[model samples]
Target chain A: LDSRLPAFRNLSPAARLDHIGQLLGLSHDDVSLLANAGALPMDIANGMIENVIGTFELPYAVASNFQINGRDVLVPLVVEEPSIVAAASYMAKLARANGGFTTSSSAPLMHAQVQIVGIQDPLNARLSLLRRKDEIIELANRKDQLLNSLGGGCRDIEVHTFADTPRGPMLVAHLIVDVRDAMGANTVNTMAEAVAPLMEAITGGQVRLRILSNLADLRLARAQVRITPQQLETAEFSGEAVIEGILDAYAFAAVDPYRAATHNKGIMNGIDPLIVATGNDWRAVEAGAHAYACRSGHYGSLTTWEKDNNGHLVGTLEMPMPVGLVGGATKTHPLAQLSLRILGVKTAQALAEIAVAVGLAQNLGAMRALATEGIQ
Target chain B: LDSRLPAFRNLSPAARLDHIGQLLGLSHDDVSLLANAGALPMDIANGMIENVIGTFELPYAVASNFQINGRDVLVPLVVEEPSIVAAASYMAKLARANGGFTTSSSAPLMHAQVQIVGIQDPLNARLSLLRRKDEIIELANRKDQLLNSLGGGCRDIEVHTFADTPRGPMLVAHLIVDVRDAMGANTVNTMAEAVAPLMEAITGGQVRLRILSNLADLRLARAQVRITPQQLETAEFSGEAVIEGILDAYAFAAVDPYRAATHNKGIMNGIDPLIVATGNDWRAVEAGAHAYACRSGHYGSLTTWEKDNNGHLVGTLEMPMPVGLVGGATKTHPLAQLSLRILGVKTAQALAEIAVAVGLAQNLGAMRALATEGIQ
Candidate 1:
């Protein structure tokens, strides 16, 4: 991947657009409008906006040298900001000097929560619900035969009982489904609705909520990177010193929630932009991720960086990534589609892996910078 | 504010759009576009697509009956999904019946972290930095005279020292600034860069990372709501029972990260669409919110729901809300401008308060539904 797009800061807006288009290999027609300051027609603008009067444009940039799971990959990021794309690409280049990023993911699983109320004995109802789990799953699966045919459907059920809530006795059931390659919101929500009637019938209680859960812990993606001290050394600081500093930085985040909060935000800085570029539901991902960060009952960093016995820097990141490849803006937005193409990922899991890798790289950038700088 | 839009679902899309436009006081031209099919012009459509063919549309709905700090407000939401807008509007309706939502906020404070490394004596450097705190703050503030003129700029400086890191001695300083009404990334980043030379001089260390921290703990927004049991009770369960159930649900989330993730996702469901609708940076907000969730060193619920001794139900939500009223999409998008106007918020803090209130209401909806239903 070409890292340098000569600085066009001195060029007119039209010339800048032309230069970018040429670099990315756009057709003449495609390049002309951007070059001339004319927006894409109203209809095209409408597709991008709520009430489209004209089109909006942001600086589109590319980050390079992402090698996920031993394969080289190019990443296209559309954002107006500078440094992010440059930093990401630079880090990825460094990562490639090693083995790049090693990544993995759980199945594209999601949760559909069904809230049952008005039951005098929620604990008893919970037991009954567990007994009828298979039936409920079947009912949910019936709503989308196509999903089932694609090897995606309701896979399991879990019920939790809350007997002394401020609102009264309550029961919440979770339907776990493997969404294959989709973000799974609609797929799961439909299934939840289908099972609502059966659930109500079985429990002898009212059904209040049948919706997809955004806390997608069951669907997780993980990425890890190893960098030798020599890799981190700068002209001013030796490589060994940089690695030790990063470790100290990590320890601070681990011990202080205030530091950890900022530390984890560094991780999301790497993840959220990719989500937005892909047109996936970034808010859903954020909720699940942050909520997961505090899963142990206190808030802390989502990533961990350490010095291994060999004195190499090791970093890891694991979080909920409920991104879909087949629906919503992923399927609708032109640039989103292009983003998917640029990543060269075939499954939602693959995309998720890449996302985690980006997050890992971002955290490294953050930690390394923090460790090397003087606070005074 | 109308809570009856759901009842109009059966109407034609045109009729539905018309009803919505009229309610929002859209001009005749805007309403007319929605009254017909093929509102997208061909030229504009061509520009929006990669392999241009046609334009796609999603339902644009508005949620009403929101009153923030005693002022009536309307919320515009755009999504393909059903029920979200309706549910939010209905909840707000109930909230308004009891004095609406009471809200408050901290200043639009942000953190800029400067990492210092290569210090032979990190502790001494830390002390040196502390001795020169005023000089450093002034240096940082010099880069943003415009922001200061607008009632925002660097407000405070803090130095943190870590003497025994794996990489070596390190010190991280935080430069806290009031970003006025913007998300503060660019603003804070510039300040971080401005103060780096001064920091390096004081600490006798190298500067590595100079960027804004997304863990916006100090810049917080909070919302609180109180509901009578009568408002919470359903046809099948007593008001007290419902309150009890809600509290039980809260406890479950508090104890289970698995549940808390979903619970917080529910909160974002209410907050994010509005963020998007307003053309604000939803991803920044998401990153801050989720990172804050784990700030206590564990991932937990973002909203707290409970019953008071007087049998009234109370819900509160507090999270890092780094949204801007004057930058990026908020200023560029017409619909986003309209969204801000519809909410009638005079300051970024007012908007943030409404954001948390919506989050609380959304969480309550999820928990209430969960608590009231029978799972079996």
Candidate 2:
């Protein structure tokens, strides 16, 4: 589709607008809006903002040279930082030498938490709620019939009871739903609210909170890459030497929380900008990610590095990819919409796969640089 | 000083400006800025941005009833989200019923990492570097004489050698610096660059990456709060019952990564907004937090809740609080400057204390609701 016609960094403001318009095949009115930095139509801006006070624009750029699973794909990024686009594209070019990144994901599912407080006996109530789980799930599904028909609804229900707390005995119910292709905040929150009254009645307690937890453990995306030592070898360092340095770096982070915190931050530097560009909630993604980092009780690395028995450098990234392809800012902001079109993804999971791949590439870029320098 | 302005929220925009101006005893020109929305000067806006394209404004609100270490103080927050200020103020109000929050912090220290890769024998080089730790520290400190004179700069050097990796053998050096009141990015990053050539000589390896890691585990902040069962008792539940419920919630999060991730997110929701308001890097904070969570090999809660023998609820929060009072956005943004003035903290550690207190309060708010409802 020759989507890379404009080359945003190279073009003037006018040339950039024309290039973008040509790629999107924009209408005359849309072309004018792109040409000027003023507010778009109220209807358009309203869809973008909650209270509708004009619009905010961030720099839009594209990262090139991505060939995922043998398929060449152009990646679009929206951020203000310099070098991020160049780094991703450069890494992708190197990755393409050995058949780009291979990726996989679980369903785009989310969890809605309904908390039942002031229960006299939380432990006993937990059993009672479990026994009536089917009824609760059915009631939750009824609130969103369209979601069920669209291949998403309450797939499972889990109830947890805590008998000791500073506030009092409490019971919490989790409604797990497959959100299909959306971020699922509003949808999941709606279902949580719909089932609150039923949960309160069944538990004989006051319903305090009906909210979607930011920890999207149920929804995950994984990406893996294998690079030969020969491919990585430079004039200064052998490819095998580079691989060993990365392993040592990983071990240090694994042993020290101090190192681990900074290590994971580097990974997110790659992930969060993409989330922002796609019009997803970077906060939610950030929350899910850091929480996941400490999943084993100790905070540590998100991406793992190792050498295969065949002496090839191997890296894998598995993280909670709580993102969406069709909602909120993704559909509202003109630039965000342009970003989605640039990505060429049909589902949230596909987008998530690309996100993790970018994150992995970024992490590698960082680690490779670090290993080359003995101590900077 | 009458910092507690009761009619602050309800006052007209102009009146509110006058009230704040009177409280701070600001100059006429300063008051004029608040009187009009476009008080931000072109020079200031230019400094905040790369190319100076207008400015972005978020509501600047003050959170009251915060008593840290037996001193009553006001906290300034710049955010778009509603109810956060209310929740923080309300919790601080309740805390004042006891003795308010007690907080402390380590010195404003940060670490800059220099990665040395392609070493054939990293383990041997590790010992070799350890013998010359003094030389490395001296080299780092020499780069920033002004920082050292200001009671900051490289304090110590740590050498870590990893012998095996997918990339190859590597050595990493950590330059620990007491950054005084700064966030320490530029200070440490500059030191890292200065020592790179020397490090290359000592290690006989190429220096690849010399940068500041976001994991600020060394610069930590802690806060604690205690509430009696009598204080916690509500119309719906007894205070003792609430305490028990909160403990259970804590235990659930301590055992489950899924729950812990959400629990920490709730904490960050409370802390990150203030960080943003202060014009600090929220992403770096998030990175360090999540990485710290997994430092022990499992993700767990950053805040702890327990019931004392006297049937009172006690909670403590210890996390990496890497915030700056005089760098980047903290000094560049007008509202951020306003936030610092409202906070009235002279040291970065003081600001760190308030940040952790806010985080602890937020955790308490979420946990109180979760425990009351028995939702884990």
Candidate 3:
């Protein structure tokens, strides 16, 4: 499939949709689902959440000219703001000449936290819980046999002790689970709840706050992009100069929390819209992205920009991208299914890969524009 | 006006909508907007973003029993996951007896960043910029007179110099502008662009990445909720025990990023849905929020959970709430406007206040459930 859409930005909305339909070989039924306005019926919206007064709508747009790992792909973005789709598409256009976005990922592992309080000698309790790890893991897997059958279930246990806290000593246990295509929240939370009794028994403390963690560092996705000076050159500035400026901008963000916030915001501009369109929990993704940015003890940029040995601009984005291909809105929302079809991605990890690639392309676009905006 | 909706949890979606419609005095057309699946037309959705593929929908629900500054409010939330809407409403129901939620805000101030590089003496360049601060503010204010006339424009300038970096010494200056009722990104970005040339001349250097900082520390919203023990008691546990367990959970989040990420995710669960429903830039809000969470250099929970002297659970949430009442989807989408009417917020600050109040309530709800689950 060819994602290249030159002069496509100027086309009418209906025409654009039809063109996309042709490119992806979408069925008339699928096109009709989007060509009409109310694919998500009121009854379906009503069932997705509590106290449903209605359904809210966001612009469902496709970003063009994206090629991931030699595969041409179109991105479906749901956003209210202008320029993000254009910027992402433009960056991807430049990237296709330079091998596109090289992507990789870790397994979709998520952590479920079990907090145990009223524990004296919390450090000792941590060892005790670790000693009974097999029992807790067994209990967690017992309730989710289907998850195990599908090749996703409790794999290991980690124990953390806060011996000195403002309230008191605390022992926390982490249930590491592979969630496969799911977002892993309900699965992890239920597993945490299932193991709470045995955790209490082993630690000699009361258990509280058994839930999933949004710091999904275990499920990491990475994307890298390289741009030549010739491609970056503009009427106002040399391409080499533009690359230097981008490096400077990145350095400023690396040292300043104030700059990093906006810098990361640009990266999310390319990510969250797709997450929204795909019917995923954007808050979970956003929480993981920013929290991971601060893992170095100081807030910094999530994407890095540098100059390679060949005098080419090098950009990369690595962060926790916890999106799901099945369950929740992904399965229920009609547009989400269509979006998956548009991207032609088969798994949640593939979606994560695409998301980070978009993020890397987005950061590159923002920096390039910033680097060359007023060089006369 | 009373926000309390007893037995709201058991009501069907249609009944809940009817109840909310009558309580808020919504017109029949307003009711139909929620009753119908296509509140935002296809043409309008295409114009909101780029590439124009289709529209995406999320369950739009109203969170009940919330009062801010003694005024009843119904919050419209657009989200996919369950439990968040239920949790926010249940916590607000508990909060109604203790004067509900009290909220406050600073002026709608945002920062426009102008990064300057190539200065030999960064400190000298910083001092020079400070000396010309008034001129820069005047230049920025001149570009947006409507904002100035509305009592929100460039108010001051702050200059910082990083003398040691991988590239060289760099200086960044901030234009603190009060944006009034707008989210202020375009407003600030315009000012930043307007002043870039003058800044480069003053520092004898180049300017890069002239844009608004998403770390909107200048614009802040705060909310506090007080819940009594009598109201918190569940069949499985006493209210006092729940409160103690909540504190312990809070300490774990305050110290650990793994827990803090999820803790903050719960807060965004309450906040981002409103952002989506209102057609605001949730990416900017999410960026400002989590960035502020790590302002102390160690990432912590966005909300503070504690016990008051009267043996009651008290919670406070303060973050950068950069929501706009005038721009983006707030003024564009039909359902977004309807949501504003449902909220009854006359000013952007008021909307920001309500958003944080919901966040605080949501954090409380999550803690309550986690603290007492399976306690019996």
* Top-scoring candidate (lDDT): 3
Candidate 1 lDDT tens digits, B208-239:
76767777888899999888889878877898
Per residue, candidate 2 scores C-alpha lDDT tens digits across A1-376 of 4423334445453565566556557666655533444322334533332222222233344566676766666665544344556667667767877878899999888988776767898888778888998988898899888888988889999887766655666677899999988889889878888888877777788776567877898899999988888877889889998887677777767655656677777777678767866767676889888777766666778899888899988899999998887777676655456567657788889999999999998788777766765323
DockQ of each: 0.20, 0.22, 0.69
lDDT of 3 at B224: 96
RMSD of each: 6.4, 5.3, 1.7
Docking class of 3: medium
- Listing candidates in order, what is each one's chain A TM-score? 0.89, 0.90, 0.98
* Tens-digit per-residue lDDT, B95-125, candidate 3: 8888899999999999988888888878988
Query: Per-prediction fnat values?
Result: 0.21, 0.22, 0.83
Compared with the true structure, model 2 gives a TM-score of: 0.80
lDDT of model 1 at residue B138?
81
Q: By lDDT, highest first, what's the ranking?
A: 3, 2, 1
Candidate 2 on B1-376: residue-level lDDT in tens? 4445675555554566676667777677656544444444544533332222223333445666778998777666544334556666667777888899999999988988877877787778777888988888888887677787988878888887656545566688888889988888788878888888888888888776677877788899999998888877877789998887677677767755666777888788678767866778777888877776666677778999988888889999998888888877677656566667767789998999999999898788777765565332
Q: Cα lDDT of model 1 overall?
A: 0.72
Q: Write the per-residue lDDT of candidate 1 for residues A215-282, one digit (tens) a residue.
A: 78899999999898887888878999888667767766765455676677667767876786676876
* DockQ-based ranking: 3, 2, 1
Candidate 3 global lDDT: 0.89
Give me the displacement of residue A227 in model 3, in angstroms.
Answer: 0.8
> What's the iRMSD of model 2?
6.0
